Structure 1
Amino acid sequence: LVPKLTASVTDGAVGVTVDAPVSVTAADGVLAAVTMVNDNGRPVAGRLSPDGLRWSTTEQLGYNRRYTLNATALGLGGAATRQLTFQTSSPAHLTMPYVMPGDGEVVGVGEPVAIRFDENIADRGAAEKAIKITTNPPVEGAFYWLNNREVRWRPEHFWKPGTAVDVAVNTYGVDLGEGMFGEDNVQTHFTIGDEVIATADDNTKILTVRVNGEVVKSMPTSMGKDSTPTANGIYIVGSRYKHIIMDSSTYGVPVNSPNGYRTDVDWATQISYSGVFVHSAPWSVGAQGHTNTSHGCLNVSPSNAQWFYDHVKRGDIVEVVNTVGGTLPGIDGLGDWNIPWDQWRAGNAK
């Protein structure tokens, strides 16, 4: 019985993807020698199994490299040697993924998994296939693309507090379309904290904060005036600022135009990419609880805005109801829950 060799690559292959290790296996014998070098002669790190049967690379293989693999097997039957050479994928472009929320964070019940690429993704299905989301307790979720670069994953309903979420973006070696390959892999983990839902009801002009179902704060508010109203819908809480300059040019609106503005405010909590915040508004305290005066943001008192800053976290929820506005776009960036579940579940990988 002459020993046989079985490699995970074929001699002469090209376009070999680097998303998996390269292996050599011996049958009816054992591996006496296995080496693999790149085109600069640099040895590739590997490991031989204690039983001598299975050898495998132990470091990532490179893009745009030619590798030469030599292997010898020995056995009572005799010996066998093979030499194999192959070339790995040569990307036309690289894209790097960025994942939110941050590793180890505790977030609110409305926080989606977010995978943002720094380039347009031509094969959204390949990107989705490369992303593994683990949930404990397990829950059904689905992917939906907000734009050509960023995909989101969430359940049908708000997360259950206490849920562990693990995200593995294994895009290295993956053809994401049109010669674009993943620049690296990413791996993050987060946990769902307490349920915090704040409701701004235009009929009362009160922003009511509920923690685990209990009213803990009631904030008089002034929202957008009729000509620049606050959109109804579900908003996800994002970033927090002790102070920030609100500049309309950020959104293509010249500061000196009718709806333009440039002002510094305190205690600002972001709730939409379109620039809606909860923030301190000393100048509208008389209107708070009575009339809408803003350009769309939720004006509250300095003390209530700081309380909001101190007690609300990324992924908590603000829901606005009964304004004269429309509904916040589902693809805003923090408007994901406004997409109906059936549409989100069906996705848009194309």
Structure 2
Amino acid sequence: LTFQTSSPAHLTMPYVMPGDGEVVGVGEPVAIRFDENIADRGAAEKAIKITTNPPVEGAFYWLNNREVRWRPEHFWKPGTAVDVAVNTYGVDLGEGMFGEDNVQTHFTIGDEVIATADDNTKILTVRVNGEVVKSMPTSMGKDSTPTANGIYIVGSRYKHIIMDSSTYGVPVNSPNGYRTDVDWATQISYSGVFVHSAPWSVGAQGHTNTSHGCLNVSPSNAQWFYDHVKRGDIVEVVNTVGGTLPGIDGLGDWNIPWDQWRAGNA
């Protein structure tokens, strides 16, 4: 170990996801997020060594100036082991900013879990290693606030969460605005799409879209989803009147075509 000099005004620390020792689903990218904007992306990428077993090709793509992702062309094979070596200690990351430390993490890929929300049927079907294990009636975004189509990575889960329109700049007093207590909420986009419990739309689930974009399901089905679907599992939304989830959403990585992803943006 060679000492590197530092200043708290010219350091950036990397934060790696997923967590060390975690089992994640087949859609989980490696994520390295810095606590500062990175001017020299090529330097960051050169300092990050990702090894896979069985080996699979993958590549870096920056979602923004703070966060780089690495993934293969297709969903991970279940059982793959992934080692992430972020060797940034003392690395010049541009504009006088230096890497503060090294970070080192390992994780493994679990079962293939893919839930398809089909707007033509209003059914969310959960498949594990190809086989249907659950079918849930759902109510997605109304035509004026539709659910975007595309591949969503499952993120964090909450037994309870508050949906407050003011975090989107829409006052709760507005026609228009809302402040809703929600149970059993699984996040699937940074923009704010969740699968969650919605007793108020149970009669519409399987029939009519009534939400602001979220995937409304029954309390029991939302708890099932909370219990059985893990970070990195996949939700694919198809056949809505919405567009496509942005590839740089935070959980929309798989919507970027592979040739653009692999070419990168460093």
CA distance in 2 between partners of 1:259 and 1:85 (Å): 58
Out of 249-258 and 323-332, give the one that drifted further.
249-258
* Pick aligned residue for 1:125 from 42, 52, 70: 42
Count of aligned pairs between the two proteins: 266
* Equivalent runs, 1:43-192 vs 2, <5 Å: 93-192=10-109
**Superimposed CA distance per residue, residues 143-196 of structure 1 (whole angstroms, 9 cap, x where no aligned partner):** 000011000000000000000000011111100001000111100100000000
Shift of 1:211: 0.4
Partner of 1:224: 141
Contact 1:92/1:179 (8 A) holds in 2: no
Contact 2:15 2:33 in 1 (8 A): yes
Mark the CA change 1:86 to 1:151 in structure 2 (over 3 Å): closer, same or farther.
Answer: closer
Q: Is the 8 A contact 1:251 1:274 kept in 2?
A: no
Q: Cα gap change, 1:199/1:87 in structure 2, threshold over 3 Å: closer, same or farther?
A: closer
Identify the range of structure 1 (244-253 vs 319-328) with the bigger mean alpha-carbon deviation: 244-253
Check the 8 A contact 1:272/1:334 in 2, yes or no.
yes
Q: CA deviation at 1:111?
A: 0.1
What displacement does 1:259 show? 3.8
Conserved? CA contact 1:174–1:181, under 8 Å:
yes
- Tell whether the 8 Å contact from 1:222 to 1:288 is kept in structure 2 after alignment: yes
Q: Choose from 194, 199, 204 the match for 2:121.
A: 204
Contact 1:201 1:320 in 2 (8 A): yes
TM-score normalised to structure 1 length: 0.74
Aligned-pair CA distance for 1:88: 5.7
TM-score normalized by the length of structure 2: 0.96
Q: CA deviation at 1:228?
A: 0.3
Deviation (angstroms), 1:130: 0.4
Question: How many percent of aligned residue pairs carry the same amino acid?
Answer: 100
Instruction: Write the deviation string for residues 1-24 of structure 1: whole angstroms up to 9, x where unpaired.
Output: xxxxxxxxxxxxxxxxxxxxxxxx
- Which has the higher Rg, Structure 1 or Structure 2? 1
The runs of 5 or more residues in structure 1 that have no matched partner are 1-83
CA, structure 1 residues 123+312, in 2 after alignment: closer, same or farther (shift >3 Å)?
Answer: same
Measure how far apart 1:103 and its partner are.
0.2
* 1:297 CA drift (Å): 0.1
Q: Distance in 1 between matches of 2:12 and 2:53?
A: 30
Q: 1:268 aligns to what SS in structure 2? A: strand
Q: 1:322 to 1:85 in 2, by over 3 A?
A: closer
Task: String of CA shifts for 1:214-269, please: whole Å, max 9, x gaps.
Answer: 00100000000000000000000000111111112223333233442210111000
Q: Which structure 2 segments of 5+ residues have no match?
A: none
Question: Taking CA–CA contacts closer than 8 Å with sequence separation of 6 or more, which of the two structures ends up with the larger relative contact order?
Answer: 2
Q: Distance in 2 between matches of 1:102 and 1:166?
A: 11
Q: Which residue, out of 311, 316, 332, partners 2:249?
A: 332
Cα RMSD (Å) of the superposition? 2.0
